Amino acid sequence: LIPIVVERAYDIYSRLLRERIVCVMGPIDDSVASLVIAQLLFLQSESNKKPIHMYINSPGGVVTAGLAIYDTMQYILNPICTWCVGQAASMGSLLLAAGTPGMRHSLPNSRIMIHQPSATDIAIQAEEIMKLKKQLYNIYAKHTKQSLQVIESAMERDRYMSPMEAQEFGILDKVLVH
Amino acid sequence: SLIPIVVERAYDIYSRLLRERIVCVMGPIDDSVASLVIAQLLFLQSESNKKPIHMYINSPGGVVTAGLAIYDTMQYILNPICTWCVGQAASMGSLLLAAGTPGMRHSLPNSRIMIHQPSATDIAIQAEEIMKLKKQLYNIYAKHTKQSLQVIESAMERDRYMSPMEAQEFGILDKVLVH
Amino acid sequence: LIPIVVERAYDIYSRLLRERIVCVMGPIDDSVASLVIAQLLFLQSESNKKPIHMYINSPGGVVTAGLAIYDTMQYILNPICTWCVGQAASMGSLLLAAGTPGMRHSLPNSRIMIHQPSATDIAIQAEEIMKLKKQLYNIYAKHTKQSLQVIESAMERDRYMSPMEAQEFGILDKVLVH
Amino acid sequence: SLIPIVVERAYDIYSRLLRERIVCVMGPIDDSVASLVIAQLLFLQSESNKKPIHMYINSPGGVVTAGLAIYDTMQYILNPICTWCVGQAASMGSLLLAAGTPGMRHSLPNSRIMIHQPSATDIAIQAEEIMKLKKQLYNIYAKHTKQSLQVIESAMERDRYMSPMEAQEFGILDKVLVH
Amino acid sequence: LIPIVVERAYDIYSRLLRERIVCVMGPIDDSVASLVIAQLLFLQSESNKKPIHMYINSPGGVVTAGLAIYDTMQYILNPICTWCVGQAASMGSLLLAAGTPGMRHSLPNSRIMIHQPSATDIAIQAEEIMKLKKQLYNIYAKHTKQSLQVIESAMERDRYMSPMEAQEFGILDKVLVH
Amino acid sequence: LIPIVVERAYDIYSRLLRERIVCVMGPIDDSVASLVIAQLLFLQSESNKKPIHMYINSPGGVVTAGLAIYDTMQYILNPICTWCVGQAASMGSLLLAAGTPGMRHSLPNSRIMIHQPSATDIAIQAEEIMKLKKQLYNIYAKHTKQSLQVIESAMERDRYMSPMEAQEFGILDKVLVH
Amino acid sequence: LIPIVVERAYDIYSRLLRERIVCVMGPIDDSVASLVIAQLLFLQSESNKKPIHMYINSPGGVVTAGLAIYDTMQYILNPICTWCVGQAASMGSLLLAAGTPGMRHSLPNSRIMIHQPSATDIAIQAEEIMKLKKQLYNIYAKHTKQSLQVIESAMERDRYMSPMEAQEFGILDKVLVH
């Protein structure tokens, strides 16, 4: 399934990590967050000044898993370029929006969604789900430079944004074709 | 699902983290998780009983006896242990979190911490036995938070999470850092 | 899953067997018994006087599988230190109590149970399960130095013991913290 | 279920046991178990047809034709075969145990031995064929225990286990040891 | 699961193939036929006069898969010793009967059946299953040197033969003990 | 499962591919077609003049997957010897018939069927299954040198032919025993 | 001279033997070896898994007598803790070094010597003494895990070791004060 490339031989995913690329593809859960966090801490130890590239094609996932990734992103010193490929929905678009200012990108045909689905590691109470939702509000507000009221009304609409809308909204900075 | 290789020598990224003296406690805790964690704690202590060990916890909880096995191994070894709450630490997970070396218990800004126990069991047990275990949790939590038993029991009765700052004031951890 | 540690590279469990540590963790069946016995015979061949450390965190298992380990423990010449970590229930607590006198240990928060559950490789008769139950009576009587009547009454009470009660009952010798 | 490595040369512990000329018959006996066991028997004979082979049996039984394949290979090779009952030997397991070289059949003290056959089969077969197989077991059991057919048939009718000393007196094994 | 032996290291089955041994154990299907055919052609390329040993413990299987092995046996130049261990039923006993004259063997306690069970890769018509049954008749007649009528009567009886019965019938040549 | 042969070591299937043998065993689907096409292109890259041996034991499979092999067989320049071992039914019999003229073979007891079963990756319309069926008619007509009417009447019969029938029909050129 | 302690009354040395303590104090000759061996066989018969404690304060003695004790120590199944109190010189330090690995001890102010004095029941020839010395070199090599050359050079030096020197050399495992 997974091919080998190139003195030294790597599986193609290990070779992408040698380029300082971290993939966040597919639904986000604790093991994805564990793998993502492991690579971020590793790449920073190799160099805390060289940029990291986080390529995101994700429909969303566990909220606490996503915030762990978000928090690790804020922790390391490295500039992080985020790229939306295919889509970034729910927790995925939160990670996309959290890359280094000026370094958040999308491919031309991507779809971006900040609406949250209607998940949880264990079952939780209504006060807890609202507390988490407020955390998403503040993080999105921080990185889009929109106000809380703008973020809450926008997240109430069950819809995807085009890459240019997300650019205008503050989720990303540039839409590139090459 | 594929674990990447990093480099003279090549390691999988998780083996590379263990060489950094990092132990991951991610996901639910059961016996095989406890076995894997204990092996690493004893190994890391055998490399050096003076160097700190960093335990990164992202766990919803798990088997109480398995969590207690990790707790005892933590207390047994001589090493300072820095615990870090990443994502969440609930039930047995926040017990391990609170059991790190005083002054070295941390959280990232957006974590959630829960000491309420869920309503699991290796074998089916009697009511006196589950109460015996629940009292062991009370005393361990009181020991490391320096709270009183009555405060611990009232707190664990509330089905809820705390922020990193509440958990710091409660005595579960010492520092909430952002960088 | 299982990490590698290092001139020589080991999976961490193979490195523990290099310390002469044998884990008996999880339920005991023939497959567990085969692996434990394989390691005990191997560790004896490396040195038949050097102590072996058996780390037990088990809820119990097949009686004949547990007796196979018990007999292999009695057979080899090595002193065996037993450790109860987490718990030792049913056949697990029998192996715990069967370590070398003076070398049976528990960590402080362990739970120990000698009550048997209400399994079997093949279905057996009532006379056969009683024969097995009496063998368990004899082994516990032998190693705890309690009488048949005391063991029979104790295994009838469906409960766990603390490390200190198990010490005073004769199941182990010391409860250690460091 | 992780198999450890032991050490100039490295083996998984089961390959190390096979280098010691030990063959495990642990768990239920089916065709693939028989193929694996037969392969090691022929290999061990090819390494040396004079050196004993150690067959350690902890089995509840299995497919009769598969067990007979092992039985025949035991009879075919020239090596003395020391058999050990560990845990239990029931049905075909007790047939192989009883088929070791005379004077070299052993049990550990707390083992159980059963020659009763259960009430399995590769394909469905007719009543005459099952009766033909059961008679082969009678003749094989009579040969190695030196008991008579009538004694074997009565004993196999009782749904029960024997202790190692009972099986010693019956002729299933020669020595019951502890050290 | 599969042990390693011995300069050079082998899994025990690869070592058996180095001894020019091919195992036919368990039910016969297309993948078994592919594996057995691969080894037969390989062993021939190493030496087309050197004998090959085929060890059969099989309850039967797909007729066309069995015919594929049978034809490869007839095709290669090597003498083939067949050995019945445990049993040879249906297609398994056809492979046993198809070894080199004088080199077809059984161990003393084997069971041999030439009756076919009441299988198919795809569902087939009544005239086609009758064509397959006749091919089996002709092959058995060829190698046992019995007549069509006797083979048809024998395969109507749902029963097994002893090693000596199969010898006198022409399925094999010698019943060996050592 | 798959043995190793030996100096260099190969799994027995990799050793056959070194001999320029391609196995088409079992049902044909996209995964098989990808594997067969990869081997065909590789073998041509080693030599576009050296013959390739395609050994077929197949009950049929996905039509488009079979056509992908058919076209790749036609594309490469190498002589292709096809061998029917066990059986070739539906798309398998189409591949057998598509080998290089004069180099299509069968073992003596094989069964060949050109009737199609009553498949497709996704659900399709009646005009589409008829277009595929017409493609099968034309390919079969081309390589057997039979007329469309002979092919269509023949494929209407749910039946197998013997290797000699298949030879007389134009599916293969030679039926050999050694 | 020998006090009585207490119901049962014992002389204090019989009371130490009830604790499974065996004293090896003073010079070693055949009668000492006979007494020590008698006690070892007795303690094993009471429990062959319970440890035995051997307290050594001896300047040495007859080589064959010391070897007799050594052989009995190796023979019994019991773990043996050896303790050096005061001194262990020549065969005494041989017995000290021959305890169960991990259970060889000294009190803080003891002196240990492996140099042999310039020891025989009857007068013997040179080759014989050489053979005995070689047996001694091999026993020390076995239990200290040093090489023959290191042991022979070490035994040439007319000197005593401190408890920590003897620990680093492999003669003992732990130096205890409380």
Ligand SMILES: O=C1c2cc(Cc3cc(F)cc(F)c3)nn2CC[C@H](CO)N1Cc1ccc(C(F)(F)F)cc1
């Ligand atoms: O970066 C850290 C670190 C993370 C955290 C807490 C934290 C955890 C988290 F899950 C997310 C967070 F945001 C922050 N604290 N530290 C301080 C000390 C450690 C180890 O010394 N390093 C350095 C390091 C790590 C891994 C590697 C390599 F190569 F093995 F991968 C090499 C070097």
Ligand SMILES: O=C1c2cc(Cc3cc(F)cc(F)c3)nn2CC[C@H](CO)N1Cc1ccc(C(F)(F)F)cc1
């Ligand atoms: O530390 C111990 C030990 C602790 C305990 C009791 C205990 C058990 C437990 F399960 C949890 C506990 F908290 C405490 N018993 N031992 C005896 C075994 C050895 C040797 O003395 N070590 C040291 C050691 C271990 C492993 C490795 C390496 F590298 F192989 F991994 C290297 C050195």
Ligand SMILES: O=C1c2cc(Cc3cc(F)cc(F)c3)nn2CC[C@H](CO)N1Cc1ccc(C(F)(F)F)cc1
């Ligand atoms: O120890 C034994 C032994 C066990 C038993 C019977 C028994 C079996 C059992 F399953 C449980 C039991 F309690 C007792 N009998 N023997 C006598 C001869 C054998 C082999 O010669 N060895 C020696 C040996 C050394 C090294 C290694 C290796 F491969 F692991 F390195 C393996 C084995």
Ligand SMILES: O=C1c2cc(Cc3cc(F)cc(F)c3)nn2CC[C@H](CO)N1Cc1ccc(C(F)(F)F)cc1
């Ligand atoms: O012993 C035999 C043999 C026995 C039988 C009959 C038989 C079959 C059976 F299934 C069970 C039986 F009891 C008896 N047939 N052969 C022919 C194959 C060869 C050549 O003579 N050997 C010797 C040999 C084998 C294996 C290995 C190694 F190392 F590869 F494993 C090395 C040497």
Ligand SMILES: O=C1c2cc(Cc3cc(F)cc(F)c3)nn2CC[C@H](CO)N1Cc1ccc(C(F)(F)F)cc1
């Ligand atoms: O033997 C044959 C062969 C079989 C058939 C047809 C056939 C196919 C079948 F499925 C069953 C059959 F009975 C007959 N035709 N040939 C002629 C040319 C080929 C390849 O050139 N070889 C040679 C060869 C094979 C394998 C190996 C090695 F080592 F890789 F295994 C090395 C050399």
Ligand SMILES: O=C1c2cc(Cc3cc(F)cc(F)c3)nn2CC[C@H](CO)N1Cc1ccc(C(F)(F)F)cc1
């Ligand atoms: O042959 C091709 C080729 C054929 C087709 C069209 C086609 C595709 C198809 F799926 C089926 C068909 F019938 C035809 N396209 N290409 C792409 C171009 C490349 C080199 O540029 N090669 C050569 C080559 C192949 C494989 C290897 C190896 F083995 F190493 F991988 C090495 C060299």
Ligand SMILES: O=C1c2cc(Cc3cc(F)cc(F)c3)nn2CC[C@H](CO)N1Cc1ccc(C(F)(F)F)cc1
């Ligand atoms: O231990 C042995 C023994 C030693 C030796 C040879 C040997 C002799 C030696 F001097 C040093 C050695 F290392 C080995 N062989 N045996 C086998 C059988 C005997 C008696 O049957 N016992 C058992 C026994 C002893 C003493 C008592 C008690 F208490 F009465 F004194 C009770 C039971």
